[PDB]
Design an enzyme around this catalytic site. Structure first.
Site, PDB file in Angstrom:
ATOM      1  N   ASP A  35       0.829  -1.207   0.000  1.00 53.90           N
ATOM      2  CA  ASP A  35       0.000   0.000   0.000  1.00 53.90           C
ATOM      3  C   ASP A  35       0.866   1.260   0.000  1.00 53.90           C
ATOM      4  O   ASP A  35       1.362   1.663   1.051  1.00 53.90           O
ATOM      5  CB  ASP A  35      -0.906  -0.034   1.224  1.00 53.90           C
ATOM      6  CG  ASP A  35      -1.863   1.175   1.310  1.00 53.90           C
ATOM      7  OD1 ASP A  35      -1.955   1.934   0.348  1.00 53.90           O
ATOM      8  OD2 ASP A  35      -2.543   1.337   2.350  1.00 53.90           O
ATOM      9  N   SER A 199       0.151  15.678 -12.276  1.00 56.95           N
ATOM     10  CA  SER A 199      -0.029  15.269 -13.661  1.00 56.95           C
ATOM     11  C   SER A 199      -0.218  16.514 -14.520  1.00 56.95           C
ATOM     12  O   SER A 199      -0.762  17.522 -14.066  1.00 56.95           O
ATOM     13  CB  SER A 199      -1.232  14.316 -13.798  1.00 56.95           C
ATOM     14  OG  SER A 199      -1.604  14.213 -15.152  1.00 56.95           O
TER      15      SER A 199
END
Ligand SMILES: CN(C)c1cccc2cccc(N(C)C)c12
Length: 330
Positions: A35, A199
């Site tokens: 994770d 991004s």
């Protein structure tokens, strides 16, 4: 030193991925969910409330010759989905894919919420975010990756997640045969304890690329892709009959529809998520309504590039002093 371990989806929807981990001496092998959105290594154990264990393999520190109780330490964690776990803490030997850390904090579960008990294929979590998020009190503990950093040939691990197929986590080296082309690296902020990056834009299907900054985290522990409402509305507008449903908790679409792909930007490069990866199947057995893999982050507070996005790429998590995230097509 290096390590290498196969990770396997837990079901036919790639809801999560499990990776065998050896704990203790002699080894007890548990299947953990790696994770990158949390920083605690916790396991079902012999101290788990018997009523909250349904099929999991449990860690038994009394059967391990290297286990030591970390006296006084406790831990308590809650995840984004409303799931929770807490307990006490041992140290022990932990090996992943041949890579060994002695004295690793192994957090044992006295209590786990209903979602963990219901999932019998996941014996625990192995957190790979930054150690500042570790929940152990009064002495915060290090992640497996932080403790293994000193001995690694290179302070990196890579996530190569499969689409309805097994994949690979590697520690300490980058496999040059696992990706096509060149890796694009982008800056990470550690400010919040996550692998947080920005991004550079997106495109829907064969539409034109929209240059816009989207701050988000690389989270192998979250199934779906969670993006701002404007972006998600632009994607689902292209799918005949798609709609946001209060009942179901997100966008659904007629199962007979074809989904367009989704492109996201990494610096000047582009990662293309095939439309098939965005199909999470019927909302209920026999339904003709299917659940979408791209959902709104509006009610979360943070954009999450989960497994849906990450499995479309070869992903380098570079834990050098200046951390960076690498993306390559594959
Ligand atoms: C509709 N549904 C069952 C779901 C609801 C909420 C979250 C989900 C996450 C992954 C997969 C799902 N499936 C469609 C099985 C989810």
């Amino acid at each position: 030193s290096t390590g290498s371990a196969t990770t396997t989806p837990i079901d036919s929807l790639d809801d999560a991925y499990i990776t065998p981990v050896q704990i203790g001496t002699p080894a007890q092998t548990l299947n953990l969910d790696f994770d990158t959105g949390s920083s605690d290594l916790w396991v079902f154990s012999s101290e788990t409330t018997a009523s909250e264990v349904d099929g999991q393999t449990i860690y038994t520190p009394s059967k391990s010759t290297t286990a030591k109780l970390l006296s006084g330490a406790t831990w308590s964690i809650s995840y984004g989905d409303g799931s929770s776990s807490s307990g006490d803490v041992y140290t022990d030997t932990v090996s992943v894919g041949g890579l060994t850390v002695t004295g690793q904090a192994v957090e044992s579960a006295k209590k786990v919420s209903s979602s963990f008990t219901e999932d019998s294929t996941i014996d625990g979590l192995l957190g790979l975010a930054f150690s500042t998020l570790n929940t152990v009190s009064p002495t915060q503990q290090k992640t497996f990756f932080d403790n293994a950093k000193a001995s690694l040939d290179s302070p990196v691990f890579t996530a190569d997640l499969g689409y309805h197929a097994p994949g690979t986590y590697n520690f300490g080296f980058i496999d040059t045969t696992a990706y096509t082309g060149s890796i694009t690296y982008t800056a990470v902020s550690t400010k919040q304890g996550f692998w947080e990056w920005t991004s550079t834009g997106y495109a829907v299907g064969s539409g034109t690329f929209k240059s816009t900054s989207i701050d988000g985290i690389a989270d192998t522990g979250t199934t779906l892709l969670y993006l701002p409402a404007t972006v998600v509305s632009a994607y689902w507008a292209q799918v005949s009959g798609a709609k946001s449903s209060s009942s179901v908790g997100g966008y659904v679409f007629p199962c007979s529809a074809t989904l367009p792909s989704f492109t996201f930007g990494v610096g000047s490069a582009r990662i293309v998520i095939p439309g098939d990866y965005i199909d999470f199947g019927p909302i209920s057995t026999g339904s003709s309504s299917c659940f979408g893999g791209i959902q709104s982050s509006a009610g979360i507070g943070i954009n999450i590039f989960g497994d849906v996005a990450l499995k479309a790429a070869f992903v380098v998590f570079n834990g050098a002093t200046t951390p960076t995230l690498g993306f390559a097509s594959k």
